[PDB]
Design an enzyme around this catalytic site. Structure first.
Site, PDB file in Angstrom:
ATOM      1  CG  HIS A   1     -71.347 -10.914 -80.825  1.00  0.00           C
ATOM      2  ND1 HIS A   1     -71.253 -10.936 -79.235  1.00  0.00           N
ATOM      3  CD2 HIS A   1     -72.775 -11.126 -81.002  1.00  0.00           C
ATOM      4  CE1 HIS A   1     -72.497 -11.065 -78.923  1.00  0.00           C
ATOM      5  NE2 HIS A   1     -73.173 -11.270 -79.713  1.00  0.00           N
TER       6      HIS A   1
ATOM      7  CB  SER B   1     -60.116  -9.993 -71.205  1.00  0.00           C
ATOM      8  OG  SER B   1     -59.910  -8.760 -72.135  1.00  0.00           O
TER       9      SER B   1
ATOM     10  CE1 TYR C   1     -58.381  -2.027 -61.397  1.00  0.00           C
ATOM     11  CE2 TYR C   1     -57.003  -2.743 -63.035  1.00  0.00           C
ATOM     12  CZ  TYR C   1     -57.727  -3.123 -62.133  1.00  0.00           C
ATOM     13  OH  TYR C   1     -57.839  -4.425 -61.665  1.00  0.00           O
TER      14      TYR C   1
ATOM     15  CG  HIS D   1     -78.434 -11.318 -71.210  1.00  0.00           C
ATOM     16  ND1 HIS D   1     -78.270 -12.456 -70.701  1.00  0.00           N
ATOM     17  CD2 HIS D   1     -77.793 -11.312 -72.544  1.00  0.00           C
ATOM     18  CE1 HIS D   1     -77.988 -13.286 -71.619  1.00  0.00           C
ATOM     19  NE2 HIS D   1     -77.540 -12.573 -72.811  1.00  0.00           N
TER      20      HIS D   1
ATOM     21  CG  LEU E   1     -67.143 -13.961 -67.612  1.00  0.00           C
ATOM     22  CD1 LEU E   1     -65.825 -14.930 -67.526  1.00  0.00           C
ATOM     23  CD2 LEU E   1     -66.797 -12.950 -68.765  1.00  0.00           C
ATOM     24  CE1 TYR E   2     -67.648  -8.684 -72.733  1.00  0.00           C
ATOM     25  CE2 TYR E   2     -65.808  -9.817 -72.213  1.00  0.00           C
ATOM     26  CZ  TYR E   2     -66.446  -8.823 -72.529  1.00  0.00           C
ATOM     27  OH  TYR E   2     -65.714  -7.845 -72.431  1.00  0.00           O
TER      28      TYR E   2
ATOM     29  NE  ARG F   1     -55.645  -9.310 -63.547  1.00  0.00           N
ATOM     30  CZ  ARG F   1     -56.406  -9.206 -62.513  1.00  0.00           C
ATOM     31  NH1 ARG F   1     -56.985 -10.564 -62.544  1.00  0.00           N
ATOM     32  NH2 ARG F   1     -56.680  -8.437 -61.863  1.00  0.00           N
TER      33      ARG F   1
ATOM     34  CD  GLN G   1     -74.796  -7.220 -79.129  1.00  0.00           C
ATOM     35  OE1 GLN G   1     -75.045  -6.047 -79.224  1.00  0.00           O
ATOM     36  NE2 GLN G   1     -75.673  -8.163 -79.617  1.00  0.00           N
TER      37      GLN G   1
ATOM     38  N   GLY H   1     -62.814 -13.108 -65.645  1.00  0.00           N
ATOM     39  CA  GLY H   1     -62.739 -12.631 -66.801  1.00  0.00           C
ATOM     40  C   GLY H   1     -61.376 -11.994 -67.570  1.00  0.00           C
TER      41      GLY H   1
HETATM   42  C1  COH Z   1     -71.965  -6.986 -73.548  1.00  0.00           C
HETATM   43  C2  COH Z   1     -72.648  -8.039 -73.994  1.00  0.00           C
HETATM   44  C3  COH Z   1     -73.847  -8.531 -74.850  1.00  0.00           C
HETATM   45  C4  COH Z   1     -74.928  -7.496 -75.282  1.00  0.00           C
HETATM   46  C5  COH Z   1     -74.962  -5.842 -75.062  1.00  0.00           C
HETATM   47  C6  COH Z   1     -75.941  -8.192 -75.999  1.00  0.00           C
HETATM   48  C7  COH Z   1     -76.884  -7.744 -76.647  1.00  0.00           C
HETATM   49  C8  COH Z   1     -78.036  -8.186 -77.032  1.00  0.00           C
HETATM   50  C9  COH Z   1     -79.101  -7.673 -78.049  1.00  0.00           C
HETATM   51  C10 COH Z   1     -79.306  -6.188 -78.139  1.00  0.00           C
HETATM   52  C11 COH Z   1     -80.148  -5.467 -78.807  1.00  0.00           C
HETATM   53  C12 COH Z   1     -79.968  -8.696 -78.297  1.00  0.00           C
HETATM   54  C13 COH Z   1     -81.555  -8.695 -78.946  1.00  0.00           C
HETATM   55  C14 COH Z   1     -79.386  -9.680 -77.824  1.00  0.00           C
HETATM   56  C15 COH Z   1     -79.737 -11.258 -77.954  1.00  0.00           C
HETATM   57  C16 COH Z   1     -79.134 -12.349 -78.163  1.00  0.00           C
HETATM   58  N1  COH Z   1     -77.825 -12.472 -77.553  1.00  0.00           N
HETATM   59 CO1  COH Z   1     -76.760 -11.194 -76.650  1.00  0.00          CO
HETATM   60  N2  COH Z   1     -75.567  -9.526 -75.982  1.00  0.00           N
HETATM   61  C17 COH Z   1     -74.291  -9.761 -75.336  1.00  0.00           C
HETATM   62  C18 COH Z   1     -73.786 -11.068 -75.072  1.00  0.00           C
HETATM   63  C19 COH Z   1     -74.008 -12.092 -75.670  1.00  0.00           C
HETATM   64  C20 COH Z   1     -73.058 -13.159 -75.807  1.00  0.00           C
HETATM   65  C21 COH Z   1     -71.648 -13.212 -75.296  1.00  0.00           C
HETATM   66  C22 COH Z   1     -73.664 -14.461 -76.374  1.00  0.00           C
HETATM   67  C23 COH Z   1     -73.362 -15.683 -77.005  1.00  0.00           C
HETATM   68  C24 COH Z   1     -72.500 -15.571 -78.090  1.00  0.00           C
HETATM   69  C25 COH Z   1     -72.374 -16.903 -78.901  1.00  0.00           C
HETATM   70  O1  COH Z   1     -72.457 -17.958 -78.533  1.00  0.00           O
HETATM   71  O2  COH Z   1     -72.890 -16.953 -80.273  1.00  0.00           O
HETATM   72  C26 COH Z   1     -75.161 -13.692 -76.708  1.00  0.00           C
HETATM   73  C27 COH Z   1     -76.375 -14.385 -77.507  1.00  0.00           C
HETATM   74  C28 COH Z   1     -77.519 -13.902 -77.751  1.00  0.00           C
HETATM   75  C29 COH Z   1     -78.667 -14.561 -78.365  1.00  0.00           C
HETATM   76  C30 COH Z   1     -78.547 -16.073 -78.971  1.00  0.00           C
HETATM   77  C31 COH Z   1     -79.555 -16.794 -77.982  1.00  0.00           C
HETATM   78  C32 COH Z   1     -79.236 -18.237 -77.413  1.00  0.00           C
HETATM   79  O3  COH Z   1     -79.992 -18.905 -77.361  1.00  0.00           O
HETATM   80  O4  COH Z   1     -78.146 -18.101 -77.097  1.00  0.00           O
HETATM   81  C33 COH Z   1     -79.498 -13.709 -78.484  1.00  0.00           C
HETATM   82  C34 COH Z   1     -80.865 -13.907 -79.307  1.00  0.00           C
HETATM   83  N3  COH Z   1     -75.348 -12.358 -76.230  1.00  0.00           N
HETATM   84  N4  COH Z   1     -78.301  -9.749 -77.188  1.00  0.00           N
HETATM   85  C1  LIG Z   2     -56.865  -6.218 -66.163  1.00  0.00           C
HETATM   86  C2  LIG Z   2     -58.565  -5.946 -65.954  1.00  0.00           C
HETATM   87  C3  LIG Z   2     -58.913  -5.371 -64.896  1.00  0.00           C
HETATM   88  C4  LIG Z   2     -60.295  -5.148 -64.905  1.00  0.00           C
HETATM   89  C5  LIG Z   2     -61.198  -5.469 -65.960  1.00  0.00           C
HETATM   90 CL1  LIG Z   2     -62.844  -5.401 -65.799  1.00  0.00          CL
HETATM   91  C6  LIG Z   2     -60.482  -6.412 -67.003  1.00  0.00           C
HETATM   92  N1  LIG Z   2     -61.300  -6.805 -68.113  1.00  0.00           N
HETATM   93  C7  LIG Z   2     -62.204  -7.742 -67.900  1.00  0.00           C
HETATM   94  C8  LIG Z   2     -62.672  -8.234 -66.943  1.00  0.00           C
HETATM   95  C9  LIG Z   2     -63.777  -9.108 -66.780  1.00  0.00           C
HETATM   96  C10 LIG Z   2     -64.377  -9.525 -67.951  1.00  0.00           C
HETATM   97  C11 LIG Z   2     -63.988  -8.939 -69.230  1.00  0.00           C
HETATM   98  C12 LIG Z   2     -62.879  -8.193 -69.223  1.00  0.00           C
HETATM   99  C13 LIG Z   2     -62.468  -7.645 -70.709  1.00  0.00           C
HETATM  100  O1  LIG Z   2     -61.329  -7.249 -70.718  1.00  0.00           O
HETATM  101  O2  LIG Z   2     -63.206  -7.535 -71.459  1.00  0.00           O
HETATM  102  C14 LIG Z   2     -59.248  -6.499 -66.973  1.00  0.00           C
HETATM  103 CL2  LIG Z   2     -58.318  -7.481 -68.135  1.00  0.00          CL
END
Ligand code: COH
Ligand SMILES: Cc1ccc(Cl)c(Nc2ccccc2C(=O)O)c1Cl
Ligand SMILES: *[C@@H]1O[C@H](CO)[C@@H](O[C@@H]2O[C@H](CO)[C@@H](O[C@H]3O[C@H](CO[C@H]4O[C@H](CO)[C@@H](O)[C@H](O)[C@@H]4O)[C@@H](O)[C@H](O)[C@@H]3O)[C@H](O)[C@H]2NC(C)=O)[C@H](O)[C@H]1NC(C)=O
Ligand SMILES: *[C@@H]1O[C@H](CO)[C@@H](O[C@@H]2O[C@H](CO)[C@@H](O[C@H]3O[C@H](CO[C@H]4O[C@H](CO)[C@@H](O)[C@H](O)[C@@H]4O)[C@@H](O)[C@H](O)[C@@H]3O)[C@H](O)[C@H]2NC(C)=O)[C@H](O)[C@H]1NC(C)=O
Ligand code: COH
Ligand SMILES: CCCCCCCCO[C@@H]1O[C@H](CO)[C@@H](O)[C@H](O)[C@H]1O
Ligand SMILES: Cc1ccc(Cl)c(Nc2ccccc2C(=O)O)c1Cl
Ligand SMILES: *[C@@H]1O[C@H](CO)[C@@H](O)[C@H](O)[C@H]1NC(C)=O
Ligand SMILES: *[C@@H]1O[C@H](CO)[C@@H](O)[C@H](O)[C@H]1NC(C)=O
Ligand SMILES: *[C@@H]1O[C@H](CO)[C@@H](O)[C@H](O)[C@H]1NC(C)=O
Ligand SMILES: *[C@@H]1O[C@H](CO)[C@@H](O)[C@H](O)[C@H]1NC(C)=O
Lengths: 551, 551
Positions: free
Chosen positions: A175, A498, A323, A356, A352-353, A88, A171, A494
């Site tokens: 972050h 990663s 896997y 939501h 891509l991450y 990769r 998250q 991704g």
């Molecule tokens: C697994 C991924 C994940 C999760 C579980 C999550 C969980 C939650 C959560 C839980 C209670 C809340 C209230 C929010 C709310 C927000 N998230 Co995320 N977020 C996630 C991935 C992301 C990512 C990635 C960003 C952008 C990061 C940056 O640029 O700082 C983001 C940005 C945001 C923003 C910025 C707004 C904008 O205009 O870009 C808010 C608000 N959010 N998120």
């Molecule tokens: C080798 C392999 C196989 C499957 C996944 Cl899901 C991952 N990991 C990701 C795939 C997509 C987006 C994010 C990830 C990650 O590692 O966070 C990897 Cl590194």
């Protein structure tokens, strides 16, 4: 601009020559011709012997009996894991190239760390269409896309069984390198370390670090509440945090990341990792009574970094991949390979991450059920229930499915739209262009993308051309893999980002990957035996069972 | 601190275990044992086949007829040059490890770009002697060292024939990455690019760059004086420069580096590279009439970076080495090797490049001789004679021999003393420790070091022990190679840092080293046909003959 059509294929570089002509640079692409589309002899062979990602994914997600044998033969496991890492690596440019402001190589794009880097160059400014030449003159209404395609009608749980421990780990972990500087704009980041430096624990700058450190025994400041260790206050540290006025003074916990007070799930992991740091300080103190506070602190930091990468590969990615093969964190696998120990966070990796759909309708702690309004900025809930109850509850509650469409909670509808809108001001190329960028066949139809009838129909009404579909929306409506949380593209794009961020970390380099770096074998062993289970067991009262999937 | 003794040999890592014991980490050193002194089987052989550097140097500086044929067979020339690059680079830690504040691996030392890095860790704070255990409790008076060993009684010319063209090039070139921030201390640098980014032409920060740029045709601001292009003024650009108040406003030339107004020799090279930048802009505009100012500027910058590395390897290092083998700048030599395209400037590299003995007693331009008080900060001299006369004159004026001792001009006495004082602030290990670090047999006596009796005696009177001699004074008094400018150590220590800084540059990486990066084949050819002579011919009126050696 003649390069607006993205004519150069197979990673060829497009360059304008005069006002109406262009030229393709096919250097080291394995192709030649006007658009770098004619395969070289050796390239024809290699292409013929490459299995499709779906073929390889099938192999790694079946034959559990076979993989159980492989996982217990160190030589084979190392060989397989080596393939996973190297197969990769050739997809990431390192040192990095483009960013939002440069679709050609420049010293500004290379040297300026405030930018996210870009896996694909930005669409040139004056093009016939926003995405190049395909699609309508205007992109569809972003709110219309969110409602018709992305908004949750009915909660769709993750078939892989990912829980809230997983969702909040995702998250918390990401972050530390996804720190979009919304003052400057979406193209810029505050994480100048561009990787896993644990700045979300220790602070991005030395000034913030000194506010958070105890300067005794290498430890981080903390407060004891009900016999339990918690993060210190803003009042005590003078370390700035994002908090509403309603949050009283004694509940403004200060941690590395200014925004981690936003949600208790984040503050949980921050507390756990804080405890882990002070735990390692105690271990190292025992091993090195001659050591001072500074070396105790720095060595502990390097160990937790090691733990983080360890856990992410062998527990987090392990669960996510589905896997049967047992992934392994081992930097020695790359010591005889060509690999660059550096990394620059890609804006597309960030986009891509945006998982939501992982978020539930309500958060369920013990007997209580909290809506988003009640759960946000609420450290009271953390103190009320305690970390132990938090872990038990988060391990049991299942997360939502990410791919497959229509699973975004209406509460974060604005955030979903922002992701689309911000992708547009950064001039992202189309979904199919990013498919090609990572060695995947472009979709020939909307129905091929979603694998169903009605969402594909909506896409066609909105976009018209399959080549006009945008990156972020397509990733969330893409046909999932069988009983999987994601579709093909999410994984194939991704994974290289990663793995690059993990193995590219400086502690993985031969000069750092030594026991003396981590204070001796005892310290080295903490890394090499770390797990999400042991992390919780060592720092959470009662040693509750935890996992990234619901039992 | 048991590690004060520096017990671990062969790149082994020392670690304290309690108050009275230590432990050596011999990982991947090729040695084992309590001290990493016992060689493994392969290592035992490798050491047997490896020639001494003095032998290798002899072979490269003799057999002029043999090398004449090797140079014309690309297969042989490429292979030899390849080994030159690789064999040196394994002596540099990349990614970087220590700095002045950390004798152990830490994230602070890795991540904080404000520090010079360190090839050898600092001597621990509380040791028996300043260098660890060897030597007297107090190092000799630094002024006594300069006066007895370093100050020039009578001018000693370089036997290799180095001229002022070479001297000022060495100064101008190296001062883009040797930019000690004395405000903070000798351990710190203002060049966060840590390499050849031509910040000394374009400025460190975007803000200063915007002050120097014209924002038309990608060009840098300038003024015409007597038909010739010169740098713009401070008044016009509002770019800060360091000038005494008695310098009139119209003579305050503004260039990328704030200190280049200090000496006309530097301002000469600043003017030439300024002309080259604007020249390349004219070339690129002819090729790309469709390009805008920003892309013309950025592409020109990348091209001038290529020219610099090209000129440094095949003209500068070529002259300096005295090799009959023709060195070659070719990034493709590394594309099949293990190599990190990154670099961090070492403090020791800075220290060993204090080549003050190069300076003449007076500066001879045309019919006139200028002393230092006359020559310093005097840009009117540059306008009076012009660049052409400068090139003609400096090409003809011999530089001083660097090694051999007693050739430092008294005019810069206090600067030479500062080199010693500063290296003591940063707690440099001994000269012999740096020899062993770079695979050199440590000297057994003062006589073996200098090769004579007088300076040997004064050395022993000062230091007492051979293992107590400091890096900087030793480099300048070391027995020079036969009819050479340097002694063994300067080359064997300096060359790894140099090559790593050159080849480690991002433009040498596979993703960048393409014609498209430089605006097409025309731009790419500018790099690959660059030389010190063509740089002069393209930008200096009359195309005067030039060279790095006197004719
Ligand atoms: C697994 C991924 C994940 C999760 C579980 C999550 C969980 C939650 C959560 C839980 C209670 C809340 C209230 C929010 C709310 C927000 N998230 Co995320 N977020 C996630 C991935 C992301 C990512 C990635 C960003 C952008 C990061 C940056 O640029 O700082 C983001 C940005 C945001 C923003 C910025 C707004 C904008 O205009 O870009 C808010 C608000 N959010 N998120
Ligand atoms: C080798 C392999 C196989 C499957 C996944 Cl899901 C991952 N990991 C990701 C795939 C997509 C987006 C994010 C990830 C990650 O590692 O966070 C990897 Cl590194
Ligand atoms: C790379 O390493 C360099 C050397 O270690 C770092 O430079 C050093 O940076 C620190 C902190 O920025 C600086 O120390 C300063 O700390 C005091 C802070 O305490 C005061 O701050 C709060 C702010 O609200 C205020 O209420 C109080 O006054 C509180 O006491 C400063 O006040 C003080 O001026 C002191 O200088 C070091 O001076 C500085 N050292 C050097 C040699 O420059 C550098 O930051 C680091 N780079 C990184 C981490 O990116
Ligand atoms: C990485 O790229 C970022 C984006 O390009 C860089 O950020 C940008 O930085 C510039 C300056 O560093 C900033 O410009 C601002 O400067 C104006 C001032 O101009 C005049 O004002 C002073 C007044 O005394 C005068 O003396 C000067 O000589 C000058 O003529 C501000 O008034 C204005 O707000 C303007 O924005 C950009 O805003 C900024 N862009 C962003 C998006 O942040 C960043 O610097 C770079 N990183 C580096 C180089 O390390
Ligand atoms: C080929 C190498 C070379 C040459 C020819 C050269 C020629 C000259 C020269 C010619 C007219 C003058 C007036 C000086 C004078 C100085 N040199 Co140099 N220097 C050179 C290599 C260096 C280096 C390297 C430094 C340290 C740079 C830093 O840390 O920024 C230096 C430092 C200095 C300083 C800073 C003060 C201090 O405390 O060190 C002065 C002043 N000097 N040198
Ligand atoms: C949370 C509920 C989302 C309301 C969506 C309003 C916009 C109309 O969305 C529509 O909803 C229908 C039923 O889901 C779908 O069948 C249609 O394809 C879709 O266009
Ligand atoms: C390979 C080789 C051989 C001889 C010298 Cl002199 C060099 N160059 C240097 C040697 C010592 C100190 C500095 C340099 C330099 O490149 O500036 C190199 Cl790279
Ligand atoms: C590919 O090359 C053909 C001619 O060789 C040209 O017509 C076409 O425009 C190129 N591709 C694209 C996407 O423009
Ligand atoms: C936190 O939760 C409590 C429930 O104990 C609730 O009363 C309060 O409004 C919440 N505070 C917030 C969301 O700031
Ligand atoms: C290793 O070197 C140290 C240097 O002080 C010495 O004390 C010790 O005896 C040595 N051990 C050996 C040679 O086994
Ligand atoms: C500077 O050089 C000029 C000749 O160009 C000379 O007349 C003048 O005296 C010099 N300045 C000093 C301070 O020596």
């Amino acid at each position: 601009n003649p390069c607006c059509s993205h004519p150069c294929q197979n990673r060829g570089v497009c360059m304008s020559v005069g006002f109406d002509q262009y030229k393709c640079d096919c250097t080291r692409t394995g192709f030649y011709g006007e658009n770098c589309s004619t395969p070289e002899f050796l390239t024809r062979i290699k292409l013929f012997l490459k299995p499709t990602p779906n073929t390889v994914h099938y192999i790694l997600t079946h034959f559990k009996g076979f993989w159980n044998v492989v996982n217990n033969i160190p030589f084979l496991r190392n060989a397989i894991m080596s393939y996973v890492l190297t197969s990769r690596s050739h997809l990431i440019d390192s040192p990095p190239t483009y960013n939002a402001d440069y679709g050609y190589k420049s010293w500004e794009a290379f040297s300026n760390l405030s930018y996210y880097t870009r896996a694909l160059p930005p669409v040139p400014d004056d093009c016939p269409t926003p995405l190049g030449v395909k699609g309508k003159k205007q992109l569809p209404d972003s709110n219309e896309i969110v409602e018709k395609l992305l908004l949750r009608r009915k909660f769709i749980p993750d078939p892989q069984g990912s829980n809230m421990m997983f969702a909040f780990f995702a998250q918390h972990f990401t972050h530390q390198f996804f720190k979009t500087d919304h003052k400057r704009g979406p193209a810029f980041t505050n994480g100048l370390g561009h990787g896993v430096d644990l700045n979300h624990i220790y602070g991005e700058t030395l000034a913030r670090q000194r506010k958070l450190r105890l300067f005794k025994d290498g430890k981080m400041k903390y407060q004891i509440i009900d016999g339990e260790m918690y993060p210190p206050t803003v009042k005590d540290t003078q370390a700035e945090m994002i908090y509403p006025p309603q949050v009283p003074e004694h509940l403004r916990f200060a941690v590395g990341q200014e925004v981690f007070g936003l949600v208790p799930g984040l503050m949980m992991y921050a507390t756990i990792w804080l405890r882990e740091h002070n735990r390692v300080c105690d271990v190292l103190k025992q091993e090195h009574p001659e050591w001072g506070d500074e070396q105790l602190f720095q060595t502990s930091r390097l160990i937790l970094i090691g733990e983080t990468i360890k856990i992410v590969i062998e527990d987090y990615v392990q669960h996510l991949s589905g896997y049967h093969f047992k992934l392994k964190f081992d930097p020695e696998l790359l010591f005889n390979k060509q690999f660059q120990y550096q990394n620059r966070i890609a804006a597309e990796f960030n986009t891509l991450y945006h998982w939501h759909p992982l978020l539930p309708d309500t958060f369920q702690i013990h007997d209580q059920k909290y809506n988003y309004q009640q759960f946000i900025y609420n450290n009271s809930i953390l103190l009320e229930h305690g970390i132990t109850q938090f872990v038990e509850s988060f391990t049991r509650q299942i997360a939502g499915r990410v791919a497959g469409g229509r699973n975004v909670p209406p509460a974060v509808q604005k955030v979903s739209q922002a992701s689309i809108d911000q992708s547009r001001q950064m001039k992202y190329q189309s979904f199919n262009e990013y498919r090609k960028r990572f060695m995947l066949k472009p979709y020939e139809s909307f129905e091929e993308l979603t694998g169903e009838k009605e969402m594909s129909a909506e896409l066609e009404a909105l976009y018209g051309d399959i080549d006009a579909v945008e990156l972020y929306p397509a990733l969330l409506v893409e046909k999932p893999r069988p009983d999987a949380i994601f579709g093909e593209t999410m994984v194939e794009v991704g994974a290289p980002f990663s793995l690059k961020g993990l193995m590219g970390n400086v502690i993985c380099s031969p000069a750092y990957w030594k026991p003396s770096t981590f204070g001796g074998e005892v310290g080295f062993q903490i890394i090499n035996t770390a797990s999400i289970q042991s992390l919780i067991c060592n720092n959470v009262k009662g040693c509750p069972f935890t996992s990234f999937s619901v039992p």
